Amino acid sequence: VDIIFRSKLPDIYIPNHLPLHSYCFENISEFSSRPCLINGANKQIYTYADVELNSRKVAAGLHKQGIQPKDTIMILLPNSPEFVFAFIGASYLGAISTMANPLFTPAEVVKQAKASSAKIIVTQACHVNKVKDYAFENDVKIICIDSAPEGCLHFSVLTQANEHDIPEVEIQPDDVVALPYSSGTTGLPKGVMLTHKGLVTSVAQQVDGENPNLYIHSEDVMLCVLPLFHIYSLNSVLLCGLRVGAAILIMQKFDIVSFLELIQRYKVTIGPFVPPIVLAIAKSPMVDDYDLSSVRTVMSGAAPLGKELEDTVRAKFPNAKLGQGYGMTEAGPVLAMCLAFAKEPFEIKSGACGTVVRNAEMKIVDPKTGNSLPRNQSGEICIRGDQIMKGYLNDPEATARTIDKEGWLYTGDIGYIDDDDELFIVDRLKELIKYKGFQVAPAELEALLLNHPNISDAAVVPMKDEQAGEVPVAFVVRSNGSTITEDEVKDFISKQVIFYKRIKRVFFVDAIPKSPSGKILRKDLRAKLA
Ligand SMILES: Nc1ncnc2c1ncn2[C@@H]1O[C@H](COP(=O)(O)OP(=O)(O)OP(=O)(O)O)[C@@H](O)[C@H]1O
Numbered sequence: 001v002d003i004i005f006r007s008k009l010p011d012i013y014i015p016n017h018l019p020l021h022s023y024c025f026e027n028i029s030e031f032s033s034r035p036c037l038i039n040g041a042n043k044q045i046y047t048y049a050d051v052e053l054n055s056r057k058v059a060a061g062l063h064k065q066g067i068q069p070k071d072t073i074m075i076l077l078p079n080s081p082e083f084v085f086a087f088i089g090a091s092y093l094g095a096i097s098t099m100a101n102p103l104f105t106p107a108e109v110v111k112q113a114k115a116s117s118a119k120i121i122v123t124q125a126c127h128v129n130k131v132k133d134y135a136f137e138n139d140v141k142i143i144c145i146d147s148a149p150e151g152c153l154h155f156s157v158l159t160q161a162n163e164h165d166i167p168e169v170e171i172q173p174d175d176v177v178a179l180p181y182s183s184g185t186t187g188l189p190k191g192v193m194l195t196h197k198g199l200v201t202s203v204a205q206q207v208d209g210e211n212p213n214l215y216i217h218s219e220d221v222m223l224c225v226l227p228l229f230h231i232y233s234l235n236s237v238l239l240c241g242l243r244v245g246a247a248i249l250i251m252q253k254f255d256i257v258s259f260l261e262l263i264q265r266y267k268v269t270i271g272p273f274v275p276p277i278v279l280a281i282a283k284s285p286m287v288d289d290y291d292l293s294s295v296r297t298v299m300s301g302a303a304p305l306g307k308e309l310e311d312t313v314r315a316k317f318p319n320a321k322l323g324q325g326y327g328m329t330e331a332g333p334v335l336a337m338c339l340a341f342a343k344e345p346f347e348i349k350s351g352a353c354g355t356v357v358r359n360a361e362m363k364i365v366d367p368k369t370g371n372s373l374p375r376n377q378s379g380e381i382c383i384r385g386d387q388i389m390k391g392y393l394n395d396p397e398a399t400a401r402t403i404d405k406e407g408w409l410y411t412g413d414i415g416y417i418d419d420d421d422e423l424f425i426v427d428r429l430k431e432l433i434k435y436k437g438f439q440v441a442p443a444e445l446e447a448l449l450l451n452h453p454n455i456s457d458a459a460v461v462p463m464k465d466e467q468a469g470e471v472p473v474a475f476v477v478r479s480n481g482s483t484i485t486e487d488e489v490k491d492f493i494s495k496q497v498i499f500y501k502r503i504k505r506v507f508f509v510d511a512i513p514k515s516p517s518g519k520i521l522r523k524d525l526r527a528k529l530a
C-alpha cells in the first residue's frame with residue numbers, strides 16, 4: 001500500500017492533447033502586441049505577434065531545408081531570440097530540438113549530434129570548428145545566427161521563408177519535441193526525451209488554473225539569465241512565460257552589477273534564479289542601493305538551497321515572495337513548486353523546495369526496504385503524472401530501471417514531506433556521506449558554511465577514512481579580507497551540529513566548480529582529493 005502525497009491545490013484541466021506551440025500561443029490574441037522577448041544585449045523588443053510570426057517563418061524555413069516530422073535539429077546557442085525561434089519552429093513541424101551547452105568541447109557536441117541524429121545544427125560562427133568536418137561527412141547542415149562562413153547557411157535563410165508555407169502535419173501527444181540533457185553533475189550527461197504531452201502538462205501544472213502555483217501574467221517581466229539549453233529555464237522561464245503572455249528579458253551572462261541594474265532598468269517582476277545567484281545576492285553589500293521594489297516573485301531552482309541563506313536574501317526583497325522550485329530533467333522537469341508563488345498564496349517555511357505539483361502523485365520510498373514512508377521521514381522522492389519524460393534517448397533499459405511499470409519515476413533524490421505538504425530535499429542519495437552507521441547530507445553542511453560572513457562559497461564531499469568509512473570534508477572560499485582558519489571553520493560547524501556531522505578537514509580554494517545550470521560539481525572536488 002503506497003502512501004501518496006498530492007498538492008494542496010485542486011486538480012485542473014490540462015489540454016495536453018494540444019501541440020506545445022498551440023498550447024503556448026493559445027491565448028496570444030489577448031496579448032499579441034505586448035513585448036515577448038527583450039534582447040538585453042541590444043535593447044530589441046519582439047512582440048508576441050513578432051515571435052509567433054518569426055517562429056512560423058523559421059518552421060517553413062526548416063521545412064525547405066529538409067526537416068520532416070520526427071527529424072531533429074540541434075540548438076548550440078547562448079540565450080537569444082533565435083534559440084526561441086528555432087525551438088518553436090521545430091515544434092511547428094512535429095520535429096525535435098536537442099539543445100547543447102555551447103561551451104562543450106568538439107567531442108561533446110559531436111557525440112550529442114550523433115546520438116540525437118540532428119539534421120541541422122543552429123549555432124554561431126565561433127563554434128563552427130566544433131562540428132565542421134563531422135557535419136560535412138554526415139550531410140548535417142550548419143546554420144549560423146551571426147555570420148555564415150564557408151559551407152554554412154545564415155539563419156536569415158530560415159526567416160526569409162513564408163509563414164503560410166508550413167505543411168499539413170499530424171502531431172501526436174506522445175511525439176518528442178525536446179531533447180534536453182541532464183547537467184552531468186554525477187556523471188556523463190543523459191539525453192532525455194520530452195513530449196508535447198509531457199511539456200504542456202508541466203507548464204500547465206505551474207501557470208494554469210483558477211489559483212496557479214506560479215502566478216505569472218501578461219504584465220510581468222521575467223528575467224532570463226539562466227541557460228535555455230537546461231530544462232529549468234526552457235520550461236519555467238520560456239514556455240511558462242509564453243503561456244501567460246509575459247515579457248522575457250534575455251541576459252547572456254550573470255554578474256551581480258549588470259544583474260541589479262537590468263532588474264532596476266527593465267522593472268523585472270519575476271526572478272527565476274538558482275543558488276549561485278542567491279549566494280551572490282546575499283554576499284553583496286550594495287543590493288540596498290538599487291530599486292528592486294518591482295520584483296514580486298523570486299524563485300530559486302536547480303540545486304540545494306538552505307533556509308538560513310534563503311532567509312538572508314528574503315530580507316533583501318521585502319516586497320517579494322521568495323521560495324524554491326524543484327526540477328529534474330527526467331521529470332518534465334518540475335516536481336514541486338513553492339506555494340508562496342500562487343495567486344492566492346499559501347504559507348511556506350524557509351528552505352522547502354515547494355509542494356508537489358497538482359495533477360500528479362508523489363511518494364517517498366525508503367531505499368533499503370522499498371516501502372513508502374509516512375510524513376516527516378527521509379526517503380527517495382518518487383513521482384507519477386503526465387509530465388514526466390517518455391524515456392532516455394536510445395536507452396529503454398535505463399528508462400525501465402528509472403520509471404517502473406506502475407509509472408513511478410525514481411529520482412535518486414532523498415527528501416521528506418512535512419505536515420504542511422512542504423517538501424525538503426536532503427541531498428542526492430549517492431551523495432550522502434557514510435560515517436559509520438550515520439548518513440550526512442553535504443547540503444546541510446554547505447548551507448551552514450555559506451552562513452558565515454567570512455565564507456563566500458563552499459562544497460562538502462566525503463573523504464576516505466580508516467575507521468569511520470567516510471568523513472565529511474569541506475572546500476571553502478574565504479571572503480575578500482578575512483583570514484578565517486581551518487579550526488575557526490571546524491569549530492563554527494561543531495557548535496551547530498550533532499557530532500557525526502562535524503567537518504574533519506577544510507581545504508581553502510579560490511573557487512567552487514559549478515555547472516552553468518547552477519549545481520555544485522562535487523565529483524570534480526572528489527577527484528581533486530583522490
Ligand atoms: N530545489 C532543489 N533543491 C535541491 N536539489 C535540487 C533542487 N532542484 C533540483 N535539484 C537537483 O537537481 C537535479 C536535476 O538536475 P538535472 O536534471 O539538471 O541533472 P543533474 O541531476 O544535475 O545531473 P545528472 O543527472 O546528469 O547527474 C534533481 O535530481 C535534484 O537532485
Ligand SMILES: [Mg+2]
Pocket residue numbers: 182
Ligand atoms: Mg540527475
